Design a binder for these strands. Structure first.
Ligand code: K
Ligand code: K
Ligand code: K
Ligand code: K
Ligand code: K
Ligand code: K
Ligand code: K
Ligand code: MG
Ligand code: MG
Ligand code: MG
Ligand code: MG
Ligand code: MG
Ligand code: MG
Ligand code: MG
Ligand code: MG
Ligand code: MG
Ligand code: MG
Ligand code: MG
Ligand code: MG
Ligand code: MG
Ligand code: MG
Ligand code: MG
Ligand code: MG
Ligand code: MG
Ligand code: MG
Ligand code: MG
Ligand code: MG
Ligand code: MG
Ligand code: MG
Ligand code: MG
Ligand code: MG
Ligand code: MG
Ligand code: MG
Ligand code: MG
Ligand code: MG
Ligand code: MG
Ligand code: MG
Ligand code: MG
Ligand code: MG
Ligand code: MG
Ligand code: MG
Ligand code: MG
Ligand code: MG
Ligand code: MG
Ligand code: MG
Ligand code: MG
Ligand code: MG
Lengths: 254, 243
RNA sequence: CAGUCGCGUAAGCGGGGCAUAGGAUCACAAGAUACAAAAAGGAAAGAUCUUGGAUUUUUGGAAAAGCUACGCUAGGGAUAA
RNA sequence: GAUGGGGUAGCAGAACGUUGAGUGAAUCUUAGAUUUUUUUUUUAUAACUAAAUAUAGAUGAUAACUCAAGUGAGAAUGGU
RNA sequence: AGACAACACUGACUAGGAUAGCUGGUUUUCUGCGAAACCUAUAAUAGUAGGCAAUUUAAGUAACAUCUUAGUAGGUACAGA
RNA sequence: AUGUAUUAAGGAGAGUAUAACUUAAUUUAUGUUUAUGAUAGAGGUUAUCAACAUAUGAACUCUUAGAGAAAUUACUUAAUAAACGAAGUGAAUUGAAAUAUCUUAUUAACUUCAGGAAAAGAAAUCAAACGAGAUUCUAUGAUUAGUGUGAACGAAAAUAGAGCAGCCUAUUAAAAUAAGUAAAAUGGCUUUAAAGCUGUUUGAAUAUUGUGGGGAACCUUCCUCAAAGGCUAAAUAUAAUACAUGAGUUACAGAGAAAAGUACCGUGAGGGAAAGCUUUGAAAUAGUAGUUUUAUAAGCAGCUCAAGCAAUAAGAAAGCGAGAGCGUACCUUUUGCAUAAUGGGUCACCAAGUUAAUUUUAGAUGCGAGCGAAUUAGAUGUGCAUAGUUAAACCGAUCAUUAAAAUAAUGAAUAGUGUCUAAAGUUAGACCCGAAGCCUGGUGA
């Protein structure tokens, strides 16, 4: 079949409420290890700082006078003191601050983004959720935190406990790998809840996700709108002349 | 186990790395593949050096010159123009101007000094079109008209073609009128535009003027000629009779 | 093969000499070709073809004299006592 | 009941090891992780078994795959 | 006196800025193949380039080597005057 | 190392509560918040058991009045390093396989002057018949045009980005619009012959009602601009300080300096160290212990054969080895080395095909007559290929030569492009170590 379904769940209860349809070239591509490899190694080269510096014999401090007479000493002839053979000499082929970044075609990088997204779809590790996804922290606790009655120490000591027992019930905690929450924008509860308890998972903004982030944890919990915006930006391989992108087969029962 | 711990490139993609001067059993050890105490081992030989013998470029000399004033045309064939019309990429009902030729991808993404229509596949071209190019071969002018079309070779420049695709200049297959009579007619057309549109330049040199002033090339300036007049600005058609 | 000349009845022969011993480019000079002509019309200076002047004789083509026992450095023992 | 088997200059292919990084908020460790040694085995530039000595819960070690090099020294009247 | 000018003077010391067709050195293992010291040119003859030609692995083969049979080129050893 | 922010004169001597810094070397006050902070006590030397903010007393000598042998004299409310900027002057090593033109190189260096930056700057600019619209910095354009015998050197238009600002009534005080000037000859610089700079000798014109300059020898038409008068912030250079980042260093590393321009060397200019911590303890080397062999023998000390000794005990033989035989170290360099040819006292550590740009190839892989990049509606951003041919254009699936042409012949025609891995050509230190010498600025009688 050319199109594959994508169930949309309600994050708190994980109830299937809507059904969307995506192309088979979006979430059902063959697994290409070479293509995924080239996109992961391409991202590491860009994150590298590449600033290591070393001095050569033409940069080491000191005078370029000849150390000893050419003849008559009875020792090996020597020139300047900055030679690689001397004690404090410079490294000939030492590291220098340069650019470690490589290039990768946009169409190849966009194929690896959808190949890593299909690897999670066929394994059941891609759980799309309705927009607005945020950790449903208790209401009374949120009333105290905002009030300022609770201290910072206790405010963090509770979130760490709730997030732990909330992720173990869902079997999404450190036991079953970890979870990555990908939302459109930053959310207070979600992002602040996974900054204090990071062993259970992490949260990321759509603009801060890489092909490597889609393969690290155990599952990817992405919003409905975020997923559509991720495939629309990484379909340069497909739309060059369309394919089903978020078509609603079953609408939410208002 | 983990997906990140199981990814790799195809084996054929990887090639042996040769680190010279790292032992005898590597095959590139002591001398590192240089030989034994020569100029190629101690220093470097100039690339142009032949041992002292004079090169052929000096014995024979460099022949000819490189023309720095020749125009660079984007060659377009009828074999390819027909394929674009059958595919729905060039609407033949409307005039096929340079703006529509460049934005169609038929001559590529490179804009050059002009576009010349060649006559490859002229025997299979039977679509009536109204094309306007910079030049056209004799074999293409008859094929375009044999099918019931119209062709006009206008004068363009590299900057003029860019402004056409950029919308900064409107296309027109007629030269600018000269004379006091037309001053108003043209000024009125400019006011109604309500937008700054650059004008397409006209040929100023002797050659370019003569190229578009003759009917053989279907030049846009051919009207300025008489049935007995010649396109040349200097030569004239002699008279044959008893004198 | 094309062009067009000579000799010969004709067939045919002739792109120097019975054969084997005369160096380029660049620059310069004399002719032709009509290619390009730095806004444009011309031109200059260039390009193509033909041709000429060379102990360019270290003749695949640098405009070039010596001393050191006051001597120096890098090598060779690939050449000496 | 396949064929082939010395090698300098030199050309070519396939690997190991070293240092750092990714997977790694991973795995293992007083029921002994790590211990420059000794020992045992395995077609083995390597790892492994066991022993002896000391005592760490991570600023510890680590398989596998991949990434990047200040990556491999009996030879320079070499340097410290 | 080529004497002296603060270890140095046929031109001091010091800082900055070189080259060396020359000499020496160039670090782990396994596996496969495997030369040349000849020709031509060179301000060359310790060098270098182009060939011959070592290697890699793809297209070809009426390839290449050897013998047999038939044929051909050319004048040595020998022998002769 | 880079980036960001802020700032725009640096050092020394001697002295002092030895965390406290200037003979006052631990001054004196104010406001706020103080555990829900900030990021109901004890303690004035048994001290500073308080942080932030805002004020405040003191702060010596020399560089630095004059003199002089700087830190002295004698006087007195005496006082400003380097790097970067501009102009002037201006080499040589080097390459061309020598070497003169050339290159190195409007370089290094020196001199002057100037500020926190400076310089430059709102067209007598570029373009080409369409138009752009000051200066400065980065990239492409561009191993291009072009010059040069060569080796090599080498633009601009334009595009992208950083900034963006225009004016004379200049936001700081300036013009009655510029004559010994433009320009020419000649001697040079620069350079493509133009334009620009310049010593010498000469020497114009008055605005598109077409006056003057420029558009790369030169004339002409046209286009464009308006010299001989000026102002202007930002993006840029350098240094100091703070902070951020790191498949950067972790003690022979990083820096020359983890207490450093100190110790020490030199008359001097100048040269210039070693050295961390409580952890771990490798090899070489030295003195011993256990097992074993050794005083009739001519061993690169290994290898082949091997008696015997060696475990107080059931089991279990590592090691040392008499005796017999084989074997003339290693590397480099050479036709050829045990060579009495080169190099090494031993061990440990440092120590050599790397990086960038550009130009290619193979393999793998993405797209595909397109590729790549870059981006409500439109446009925007190098390049390569898609058509070949010729000296070159016209021409064109045909083109070139045949002084007219013409199948007469001959030659040339069919998937590209991006990325990764690896090997490479070119230019840079270019795999590493090593000269004698040349030039410039300083030092010393
Ligand atoms: K004498
Ligand atoms: K020469
Ligand atoms: K050129
Ligand atoms: K002015
Ligand atoms: K030891
Ligand atoms: K020795
Ligand atoms: K190394
Ligand atoms: Mg020097
Ligand atoms: Mg160092
Ligand atoms: Mg890489
Ligand atoms: Mg070899
Ligand atoms: Mg080689
Ligand atoms: Mg090679
Ligand atoms: Mg050698
Ligand atoms: Mg050689
Ligand atoms: Mg002209
Ligand atoms: Mg000769
Ligand atoms: Mg010859
Ligand atoms: Mg054999
Ligand atoms: Mg072999
Ligand atoms: Mg141990
Ligand atoms: Mg050594
Ligand atoms: Mg004498
Ligand atoms: Mg003397
Ligand atoms: Mg063999
Ligand atoms: Mg031989
Ligand atoms: Mg010669
Ligand atoms: Mg030589
Ligand atoms: Mg005979
Ligand atoms: Mg004073
Ligand atoms: Mg004074
Ligand atoms: Mg430039
Ligand atoms: Mg004026
Ligand atoms: Mg003048
Ligand atoms: Mg002029
Ligand atoms: Mg001039
Ligand atoms: Mg002028
Ligand atoms: Mg001109
Ligand atoms: Mg150090
Ligand atoms: Mg250490
Ligand atoms: Mg005995
Ligand atoms: Mg020896
Ligand atoms: Mg070390
Ligand atoms: Mg090392
Ligand atoms: Mg290969
Ligand atoms: Mg072409
Ligand atoms: Mg005296």
């Amino acid at each position: 079949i050319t199109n594959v379904p994508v169930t949309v769940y309600s994050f708190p209860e994980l109830e299937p409420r809507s059904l969307e349809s995506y192309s088979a070239r979006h979430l059902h591509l063959p697994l290409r290890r070479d293509i995924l490899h080239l996109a992961v190694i391409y991202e590491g080269d860009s994150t590298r700082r590449g600033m290591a510096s070393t001095k050569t014999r033409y940069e080491v401090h000191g005078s370029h006078k000849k150390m000893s007479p050419q003849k008559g000493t009875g020792n090996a002839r020597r020139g300047t003191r900055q030679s690689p053979l001397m004690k404090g000499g410079g490294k000939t082929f030492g590291p220098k601050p340069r650019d470690f970044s490589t290039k990768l075609n946009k169409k190849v990088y966009d194929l690896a983004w959808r190949t890593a997204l299909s690897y999670r779809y066929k394994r059941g590790e891609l759980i799309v959720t309705e927009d607005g996804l945020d950790l449903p922290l208790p209401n009374d606790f949120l009333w105290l935190a905002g009030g300022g009655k609770l201290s910072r120490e206790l405010e963090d000591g509770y979130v760490r406990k709730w997030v732990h027992e909330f992720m173990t019930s869902l079997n999404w905690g450190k036991e079953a790998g970890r979870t990555t929450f990908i939302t459109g924008d930053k959310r207070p509860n979600l992002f602040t809840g996974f900054e204090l308890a990071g062993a259970e998972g992490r949260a990321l903004e759509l603009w801060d996700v890489d092909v490597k982030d889609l393969l690290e944890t155990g599952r990817i919990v992405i919003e409905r709108s975020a997923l559509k915006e991720m495939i629309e930006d990484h379909q340069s391989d497909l739309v060059t002349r369309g394919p089903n992108l978020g078509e609603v087969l079953v609408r939410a029962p208002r | 186990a983990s997906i990140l711990a199981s990814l790799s490139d195809n084996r054929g993609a990887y090639h042996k790395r040769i680190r010279k001067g790292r032992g005898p059993s590597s095959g590139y050890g002591k001398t590192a593949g240089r030989g034994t105490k020569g100029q190629k081992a101690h220093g470097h030989v100039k690339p142009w050096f032949q041992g002292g013998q004079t090169p052929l470029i000096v014995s024979h000399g460099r022949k000819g010159f490189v023309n720095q004033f020749a125009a660079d045309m984007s060659e377009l064939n009828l074999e390819k123009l027909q394929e674009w019309i059958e595919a729905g990429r060039i609407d033949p009902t409307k005039p096929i101007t340079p703006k529509e030729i460049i934005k169609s991808g038929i001559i590529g993404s490179s804009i050059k000094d002009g576009i010349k229509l060649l006559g490859r596949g002229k025997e299979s071209f039977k679509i009536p079109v109204t094309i306007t190019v910079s030049r056209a071969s004799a074999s293409a002018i008859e094929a375009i008209e044999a099918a019931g079309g119209k062709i006009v070779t206008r004068f363009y420049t590299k900057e003029s073609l860019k402004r056409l695709v950029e919308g900064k200049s409107l296309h027109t297959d007629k030269p600018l009128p000269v004379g006091k009579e037309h001053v108003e007619e043209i000024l009125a057309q400019a006011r109604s535009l309500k937008k700054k549109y650059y004008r397409l330049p006209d040929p100023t040199s002797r050659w370019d003027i003569e190229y578009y002033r003759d009917p053989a090339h279907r030049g846009y300036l051919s009207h300025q000629l008489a049935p007995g007049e010649s396109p040349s600005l200097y030569f004239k058609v002699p008279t044959g009779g008893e004198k």
